[PDB]
Design a protein around this nucleic acid. Structure first.
Lengths: 436, 470, 436, 470
RNA sequence: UUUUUUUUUUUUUUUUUUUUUUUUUUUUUUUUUUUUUU
RNA sequence: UUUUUUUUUUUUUUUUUUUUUUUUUUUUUUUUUUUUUU
């Protein structure tokens, strides 16, 4: 049944929106200031810093960074008669812990935590990707497309584990392998047993993510090495460059700004009654009547900022630019010529230059975002023997194979997925590559 | 965090200034004599000769040079009613060792040693550069600009290693290569292992100093030769003449005279409390209210001597003359027509001719001195995506950059790896004497403390000459 | 040249005897009490506890065992008019450190330390052998004969390393192997490097100890294992049971009681002038005119005690009983029917029962004790292939092969090794086995 | 060191005695009523029912037996002017949990729990032994002597595991084997893994309990069966009837009534200062000046009740009657003609017949109770040298014990390993009912404190009967 | 002519055992009573 | 119909580099002086 899942997610987002309402009440912010992305961003890093129970335990025994008992950051942006000012207001974790506890009807609301931390991962992937660490592990910078969910820490659950990319898992496992190579860390002690356990958990997440049998079997055989040394490093690099084309079935969770939920809940649109979905039309229509204000530099233009915000909201920064333009109805500029910077504001930037303006989120069309792979795969002793089939499959692969047969782009006016329209692009080589 | 580094350097310079105070107390010198550069210079060669533990061990087993048990030199200059007299006062190392130990609160203070020895290297580079050794190794005398930190011996640490120039490392490595060519010194013994170790330490210092990937890779491949013979000699000469334009990111440590620190500490300006920095405004403002006296020949003029002292203090002898003039506000005379000599006084020079006078160190402006490079190396292989991920479920093609996909996988036998000089040549051809560097940074005024608003300089004064030598 | 070695050992033993003279002066003991083995034994454990610089450093950071700042034990035995009384007199290390420093003319005298600690190892091997640890490592108790120098710690030098038995090294290496198996201790850290270094030092000591090429080569190949696991355990057990017959050339250092040296030095017999030797006639003739008193239980007999003391002095507890009887001239009782106990006295034993009496050390003959092996050996991919030659050599070995051709037992009256007498035993099967 | 163990046990028993003091304060009982065994017995079943965390968790999900939220039993006996009355006062666990927590200075005091539960096991073994379960598993009723610590559940730690008898472990393992035979319970699930783990823990407890190598090896080989079926049942029955004579080294923990500790603590005899021991003179001298009152039926005699109480206190119900009589100084009546019943009072017995009187615990002598075995197992394979080392350089043969040298090397295929019962039988035949044990140890007098001089007992009183049952 | 290195708790009651040795939970049992009965 | 684990120091000045980064000793040199001479 799907009604129970819809009711659960509706209750969750209703609690999130009511927490947004209460923070707006408590912060004494104006109506416009309650529609600012920066305030929600800072509040949600406060959120993660309050539920990072592992880091809370680590920092209680580590009193450093000066004035850091329980309070971090808090750069609240406020309006005086047109101008803007930031105040470093410090909030302790514990009261916000109870305000959450009262916001979800006595529950912890860890799932909502997973969705907010994933949405932060989505915005991070949209804005900046780290070839720095990618080459720190020595892997080439050609695979920036598989850094989805890279910023997500381990503390997230299965729902968080679903959206992390294959390359993110590759980086996380190579970190553990290099740590176990630097020092003899795999002893029979509890630490070795626990890192072992985390290793097979991440590995069966990996093998669940893939679709073709060959890569699943070679991941199975990579496990057979009780002592991860150097050979497994190139083995899993080969796995990664095979997943470049033999991509894993990774989900795309549609989370939206902290405000969008709050404005919807404030207006009285109860999500429990009519039901809510995370993959269907829902996050599209909530943005059809949503107003969002944002802060922009004197050199930054808002036109690219709105498109980057739509990237962050719908996690389409790793998709083809042509398709995103089709759903937008307007051309989406690649990152090569974006005359904009990161959404977050640096701690040293002055305030006389900063200017607030609206963001456009309306899209002409809507589409389903399933956790499936291209139809091209369906059309098609050690690790090297399977690398041979990897090579022959890569040779069989073509840049022409059309995927996603039987599905299409839909119009906004339809609610039950009745009749789609088939898109068709013949616009030469505009560039289906967000980076480069 | 940067507060801890500031506190550490403040404590270090406070200890240095207090040691200067105690030497002034012990030497029974007057107020004017405590503001003489020569006294600090001699005292600091005493300093290095007392912490040169390697040379101490070498000389204990080598009792030569006549009366040299523990005492060397010591030409202290003193005033009698206007006139000057030098006394060869000999100080043993050990008591000064304990006076240091009490001056840094029970610590050895080796970092301060590194900064004083670097400052001696700075003054040496400002005064005299050795094409003698540069052609002893046979390298042409055109590269005198890369002799920064040449006088620095190996005993300095990482902080000392940061400021040594690329050419200094080239000279040091060619010395070892020629020694290993003269005799079969790379045997499996401990000496060969230790010289090997020092070799890779100097080489990863080198590759850390560079910025572009091509030179970093060719330095990596130079390492692959287990037996350094003759080919590596021209290989690293090519490396050096490539670094002529593809310069390495070498730091510029701002050390000041032995007295300047002592006068500041004596007045009660504690550096631990307000914090201290080695790159920012700090050494500039301490010289804004510093008085320095110096010794000058009857033919030498003090006007060029003050500018040469500013060179030595701020290690700007290898920079453009126009920029140094802009910060000075007055024209800086190149070494071609400097009617002056070395700061240090020869052991045979008479004293009736010698005359003491003030030095000018005030500068109209101040600027940050980062360990970065210009901007003319970024035209080669660009980055970008190679694959795509389906976000929306739309019936569309999945664009794959296939010809690079084979390139990553491939699976054949590479021909060879020896043509990086070719990219060196093409980068040199791409380089122009017009490319402006250091975008987004500017020269600042003295009255500002937090780097608020700079002023952009602009020189159109023909070809006055941006070359300190020649 | 051999004169320099003789002069060095003579100077060393002269310093030792002068230290014995000064301890007799300082302790205010009588003439008889200066000829007691127990006093010298306690004083020499004080000696080792004062030069155990490693243990000194370990105990300074570990203030335990109640009153233990610098002083340990010290059960000095004294006579009142026939009866005996023990006093627990505590001496600190440091003053005895300087008294040594003045006793060896400003030198540390570490070699003398090695000889005293070896002589303690000799007495320990003579009295009690530990099958407890031998089966703690799981090795069978059949090899008690290779426990020579077992009590010797690592701190001894090359001279100490020469006399340690093959089985002692086997036990020491198995201890390190089991420690490295229990935890991942072979990391790239300094501890792993240092235990590695100690490992090859002990191994080339081992391969120096052996004589035949096959065992030297298999010890060389045992080294090739960078990770000592379980296979090397049985490999080196096979090495040990091969050394059972293919015995290693282990020296036998002839050290004598703390008093014997002191009495000789007190009488004015300077050893520097006439020269001294550790293998030749020397320790034999010094015992020809030496008087020794010892403490005996009311049930213990002195007849077996004197023979056990001769065992401890000449380290002949692992030799054939028949030969030791021949040099003695009297039958030597094996340990099976020795109605005696350990030489050292337990801390709880009462004093009214204890009785002091002389010990006999005179021997009818004298013999050289070289660090060579039996002449029987001269008559004759992995570890198992060499185990094959081990088995065939063992089969070629016979319990009849006579060894030590060209050498014989000598008389006391001869000084320059002129003419020996060939012994010949036909006394059935009296038993050439000290244990069992 | 032994001082730390003595201090720990002294602190533990001091906490126990202080808890007894506080229960006496809270229950408003008189001085005489505080010296009753029944009150302490009921209070200590309350104790075990409060720390039976496993049963607490099982009963919270199982609300049965009527009024049983947190309270069980509680038959407190009280005096009115000579007569006796029982009140069913119900106490919840949780407040007593905190009163313990405050009684042991913030600690849980689980060790004390182990000693009280062992002392309940001791009294149960003294009073009634279950041939009912012994024949439920089908084992003959001849082995009632190995039911020591039978009532002890698994929750006890290593200290509790030490005192459980061999037969108790045999019963516990046969229960698990029969459960695994009834249903396929050894699957790869967590339950199978955990019962497996408990199985090897109980088995290495077993092999630690034994002394001779043969039984230790056959227990090792019993483990090799991954699927415990029927053969292992008779295998371990043979193990048990071998342990009948080849007894295991099982300890005898000397616990005393709940009151005895309380009276000693109340008088101010701190056990931490002077030290306490569980095996030495200690529990003997505390009973030398201890007063105990008990409840007796109108038909029961107190003379046998005092002796049975001494049995329960010192766990001597499985020992020879003659020895217990010697330490007592009076004849100890075997259970065949004991005109008494169980110490605990049935829930339906009336109160007009019940009469309270003193108990005698004074003993003429004292003895150590070590966890060692007799002496009749040392006739088999002896040890000794196999090789020799040449000490003197003499022309002589090197004696080698060749036939054992092949035996150590060998290199063939062993026939089988299932004939250890054969050595069991031959050892049993070698065993005699005459072999005297415990050489070098004797019975001591009360006046001695440091184990100075014993007296050797000697019994020639025919066949009075060294068998408590039958 | 062959040599003083230190890494988290051991040992002289004694001669071939013993360990300074430890709070885990899985579907219904038991105090009318002492060797049967379900 | 698929899920909150914690182990010794990191990060919001910024968008693809830079590192919070460090006292080793091997057979005769150098302050008459600034680019030669041995």
């Amino acid at each position: 049944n799907a009604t129970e899942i819809r009711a659960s997610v509706g209750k969750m987002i209703d609690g999130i929106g009511r927490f947004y309402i209460q923070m707006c009440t408590e912060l004494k912010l104006s109506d416009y200031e309650g529609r600012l992305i920066q305030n929600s961003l800072t509040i949600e890093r406060m959120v993660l810093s309050a539920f990072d129970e592992r880091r809370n335990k680590y920092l209680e025994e580590h009193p450093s960074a000066g004035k850091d008992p329980k309070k971090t950051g808090g750069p609240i942006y406020r309006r005086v008669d047109g101008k803007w000012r930031r105040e470093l207001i410090l909030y302790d974790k514990e009261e916000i812990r109870r305000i959450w506890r009262q916001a979800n009807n006595g529950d912890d609301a860890t799932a909502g935590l997973t969705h907010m931390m994933i949405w932060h991962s989505n915005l991070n992937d949209a804005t900046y990707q780290r070839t720095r660490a990618l080459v720190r592990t020595g892997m080439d910078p050609r695979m920036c497309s598989l850094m989805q969910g890279s910023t997500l820490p381990r503390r997230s659950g299965a729902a968080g584990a679903a959206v992390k990319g294959v390359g993110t898992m590759v980086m996380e496992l190579i970190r553990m392998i290099k740590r176990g190579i630097n020092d003899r860390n795999f002893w029979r002690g509890e630490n070795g047993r626990r890192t072992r356990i985390a290793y097979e958990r991440m590995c069966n997440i990996l093998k669940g993510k893939f679709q073709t049998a060959a890569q699943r079997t070679m991941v199975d055989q990579v496990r057979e090495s009780r002592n991860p040394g150097n050979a497994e490093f190139e083995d899993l690099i080969f796995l990664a460059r095979s997943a470049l084309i033999l991509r894993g079935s990774v989900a795309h969770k549609s989370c939206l700004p902290a405000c969008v939920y709050g404005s919807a809940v404030a207006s009285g649109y109860d999500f429990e009654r009519e039901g809510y979905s995370l993959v269907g039309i829902d996050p599209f229509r909530l943005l059809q009547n949503s107003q969002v204000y944002s802060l922009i530099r004197p050199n930054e233009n808002p036109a690219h900022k709105s498109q980057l915000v739509w990237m962050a909201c719908h996690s389409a920064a790793f998709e083809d630019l042509r398709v995103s333009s089709f759903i937008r109805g307007t051309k989406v500029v690649p990152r090569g010529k974006l005359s904009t910077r990161g959404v977050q504001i640096a701690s040293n930037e002055n305030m006389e230059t900063m200017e607030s303006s609206t963001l456009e989120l309306r899209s002409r069309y809507w589409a389903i975002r399933t956790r499936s792979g291209g139809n091209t795969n369906q059309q098609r002793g050690r690790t090297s023997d399977m690398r041979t089939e990897i090579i022959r499959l890569m040779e069989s692969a073509r840049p022409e194979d059309v995927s996603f047969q039987g599905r299409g782009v839909f119009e906004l006016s339809d609610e039950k997925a009745t009749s789609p329209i088939v898109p068709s692009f013949d616009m030469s080589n505009e560039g289906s590559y967000f980076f480069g």
